Design a protein around this ligand. Structure first.
Ligand SMILES: CCCC(CCC)COc1cccc([C@H](O)CCN)c1
Ligand SMILES: CCCC(CCC)COc1cccc([C@H](O)CCN)c1
Ligand SMILES: CCCCCCCCCCCCCCCC(=O)O
Ligand SMILES: CCCCCCCCCCCCCCCC(=O)O
Ligand SMILES: [Fe+2]
Ligand SMILES: [Fe+2]
Ligand code: NA
Ligand code: NA
Lengths: 513, 511
């Protein structure tokens, strides 16, 4: 973990304030020691333009995509940023107004889907793509930050969109999930082959998950992956297709206007056989929650361990993320969040071998968990979680692990961004076996998602650092900095200060050079 | 909290072995220093006779009630025990066989009065109880049995729990099934006329049943200055089996239980002072519940701290003596598919505004518990988990009851169960989730009972007392353990030269 800080000075407002791009990189001023083995680029995406002239964007996810880069070489750091030349951005700059409808901001005058790639960036073959959650992803140059092209996934595969959280196997194979308007489809993009053709042209749907409601598919943000299984969590946050596919020009609608909460379904969990490409018909059921981020998933004897960042309730958490709410003063921010769903890290355990003879009993026979799974007579398997972390309006969010070596596998550690009534104000580490936590936090300092980078000679799982971008608007300080923490105990190793503001960023990666 | 010990020697079997009563008290041999302010009697109940001749009792809750007493005076300790002369026991001794049907043992009809579970004060009297209509008046100084009391002669219930709440003026509240509702009984304090307060018993409020024909098993309930809290679980009593003739079919109490798979848990509150059921449909996931820890009011909310078991299967299925007497690897294996124990805090909003439909009503600043108002007006609850360990139950909870019962509090003491075997003592800070453990190898404790220093201003300024069975051959068979309530460090122990079997509940009676 929890925060030990209040924010009466309101400095978190700087996260949602427009900035200018740069012509070329700035030097970041180092204190402490940047590790000499740290060579490459921290790439991250966020909104950077929160109004076009006098027309405001209303939601956290509406501001125009800004691509950020911190470069590390021989103990020195540079910072650079460029707006992504999406259709949304280019047309806004041409017409000097909001032209494309964003997540929570209707544009005044069917109509074009946004390609505002403000959320994440990921590798496909030798390319990098910035994304949001629509059918449009934007190819970008990781060295110059130039925009290369728009890619419409609809030209290649049968999905209406895909999440900003594809899984990436160590050979470069990419898996993602997307709505299909009815199913949820797993897309597979293979590694780059000898022929050097673009791997997106070899995309395919490999398996399909069914929908609980013919006309109302669930919002999906992420999914789990193990060597043998795919895990999909179907939440009660629904997309109303009667509103989504109606004409938005007539009604004046945006994406937020299409969400509704199903009160009675709870959460349905789904698994598929990855290698045999087959949906498994196990009716896993539990209580209602929102889910954005899976932490990690793995196999342990005949069971799937599913670690999740949950929000307890069926109301859509995105309702609390209009910019007007996030720009309020601190007492009002806390008050507004009182009735929101509560964040909680939970471990669910999914049995793979269901024996009818155990009807009415707990199938989770593993020795090291308090998670349960009850086989009912109607063949639903009712799940209860083991709670790994819980604090009052203190979210362990934007989870990251040592992904390259422990993604999809037995693991011990997760790193997170700590939210305090939705305001990011600390960095966290969680031992998922012991429930021990570590916190890093300074007054009036607003961090981003921490990204893990392994030491080249790592023996343990947490032999490395985490990198986070911190906004520090206190007038006795430079506006922002890159923070490097030792992954062992979250003690500070270095920081690299820059003389300009940085707004909120969501996700990213470290690209080794 | 969790245990750090395995039990391959099987010493826990001594908890379920018959013992002989005593003719008069033994001296318990003290090591360390019994506090000189500790003056009175630890009274506790458990089974003590696990077979009548060659006829065995089958279930944990079948053996014949044994009343135990440790006396504390000027740093000296005595131990004494007597079988309760119930109808079940007396008739068994007369007829040299099992005459009355017990919880899980059919006799080859009359309701059992085997008062093996607890003891509590009414007026100037003490009553040993089980969970039926029969409670047994007993003498707290001599351990003699005085009389049988049939609650049905006084109030409209079929039984009452072994966990009545006791207000500081001596008023007693309890809950019992009525065969259809759950009735709260109130027994007033002793008046000037000196008449027996049981004759002034009354039903003050009634909770509805979720199923006309299948009432829930009820073990305990919550009480605050202003409210009564009742948790209706999916463990049901099948009245078609309960009220059928058991002589023909050969049935016991265990044979009447079934689990409702779809209802989950329904939580109920009543206005205590206005004697009125409140129509708030609190709903959550399925669990068994035996013991409320404590209940209190905080702004417009009820804080409900519970020892839960995650699942709808009846936990009592895992407590046949044959299972509990298995070797350690088999005990662990048998418990793998049982419900998981978990301490949970639920938060019940009292002011429900329809304008908040679809939102979380729990606006308190210090909890992660939630309560969602649905369109059908059910309020769906999620807990804050306070303690969770794999088959490691924080159970038999106790608090500083006299000063913090029904009120804001910080500390609970518990007996730690390891795949159902009691092997440690625990303390839980319910605000910080910090835990403390006391544990020795091959040592099987009982429920810890808290005794305040008489002049304490703080909540945990006192000791806990537990009766520990220690069958290791380098030790006396049992002892009374005294721990400092601050940190569970040992203050003293009082060893006795005879075995003591399992005990369930009890009290400390100040003299
Ligand atoms: C009706 C919903 C539709 C759903 C995709 C439908 C294929 C998602 O749509 C969008 C649109 C714009 C922005 C975003 C952001 O990525 C959300 C925050 N990460 C998602
Ligand atoms: C069908 C259930 C009936 C129910 C009472 C219904 C008036 C409870 O009956 C009994 C009978 C005998 C022993 C016990 C033990 O106290 C249980 C463990 N504490 C309860
Ligand atoms: C650094 C962000 C701070 C302000 C917003 C925090 C509220 C986050 C709520 C949970 C995560 C929602 C998903 C956002 C990340 C994403 O778009 O992938
Ligand atoms: C000291 C007891 C150890 C062996 C039995 C432990 C199993 C306990 C399961 C939860 C509590 C069950 C109710 C027992 C207390 C009572 O009868 O009032
Ligand atoms: Fe995300
Ligand atoms: Fe009990
Ligand atoms: Na600090
Ligand atoms: Na010890």
């Amino acid at each position: 973990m929890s925060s030990q800080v209040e924010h009466p000075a309101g400095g978190y407002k700087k996260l949602f304030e427009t900035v200018e791009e740069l012509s070329s990189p700035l030097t970041a001023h180092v204190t402490g020691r940047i590790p000499l083995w740290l060579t490459g680029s921290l790439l991250r995406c966020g909104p950077g333009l929160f109004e076009v002239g006098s027309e405001p964007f209303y939601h956290l996810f509406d501001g125009q995509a800004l691509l950020h880069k911190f470069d590390f070489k021989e103990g020195h750091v540079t910072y650079h940023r460029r707006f992504i030349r999406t259709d949304a951005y280019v047309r806004a700059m041409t017409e000097k107004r909001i032209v494309i409808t964003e997540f929570g901001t209707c544009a005044f005058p069917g109509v074009e889907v946004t390609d505002n790639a403000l959320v994440n960036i990921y590798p496909v073959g030798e390319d990098y793509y910035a994304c949001t959650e629509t059918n449009f992803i934007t190819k970008v140059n990781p060295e110059t930050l130039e925009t290369i092209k728009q890619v419409d996934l609809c030209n290649y595969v049968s999905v209406n969109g895909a999440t900003a959280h594809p899984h990436i196997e160590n050979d470069g194979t990419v898996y993602n999930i997307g709505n299909c308007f009815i199913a949820y489809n797993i897309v597979k993009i293979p590694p780059l082959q000898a022929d050097k053709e673009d791997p997106i042209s070899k995309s395919e749907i490999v398996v399909q998950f069914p929908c609980s409601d013919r006309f109302k598919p669930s919002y999906v943000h992420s999914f789990g992956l193990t060597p043998n299984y795919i895990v999909f969590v179907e939440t009660p946050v629904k997309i109303n297709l009667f509103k989504f596919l109606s004409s938005w020009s007539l009604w004046g609608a945006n994406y937020m206007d299409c969400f509704e909460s199903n009160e009675t379904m709870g959460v349905w969990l789904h698994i598929a056989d990855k290698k045999r490409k087959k949906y498994i018909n196990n009716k896993y059921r539990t209580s209602p929650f929102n889910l954005f981020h899976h932490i990690n998933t793995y196999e342990d004897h005949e069971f799937l361990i599913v670690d999740l960042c949950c929000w307890k309730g069926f109301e859509f958490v995105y309702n609390y993320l209009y910019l007007a709410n996030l720009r309020e003063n601190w007492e009002e921010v806390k008050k507004n969040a009182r009735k929101a769903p509560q964040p909680e890290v939970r471990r669910y355990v999914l049995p793979l071998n269901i024996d009818k003879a155990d009807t009415g009993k707990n199938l989770v026979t593993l020795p090291n968990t308090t998670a349960t799974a009850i086989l009912c007579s109607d063949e639903t398997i009712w799940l209860e979680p083991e709670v790994l972390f819980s604090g009052p309006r203190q979210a362990f969010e934007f989870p990251q692990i040592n992904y390259q070596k422990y993604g999809g596998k037995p693991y011990t550690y997760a790193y997170g961004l700590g939210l305090n009534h939705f305001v990011p104000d600390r960095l966290c580490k969680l031992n998922v076996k012991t429930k021990e936590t570590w916190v890093w936090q300074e007054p009036d300092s607003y961090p981003s998602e921490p990204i893990f980078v392994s030491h080249p000679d790592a023996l343990e799982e947490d032999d490395g650092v985490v990198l986070s971008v911190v906004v520090s608007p206190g007038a006795g300080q430079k506006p922002a900095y890159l923070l490097i923490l030792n992954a062992k105990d979250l003690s500070e190793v270095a920081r690299a200060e820059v003389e300009i503001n940085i707004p909120v960023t969501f996700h990213g990666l470290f690209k080794k050079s």
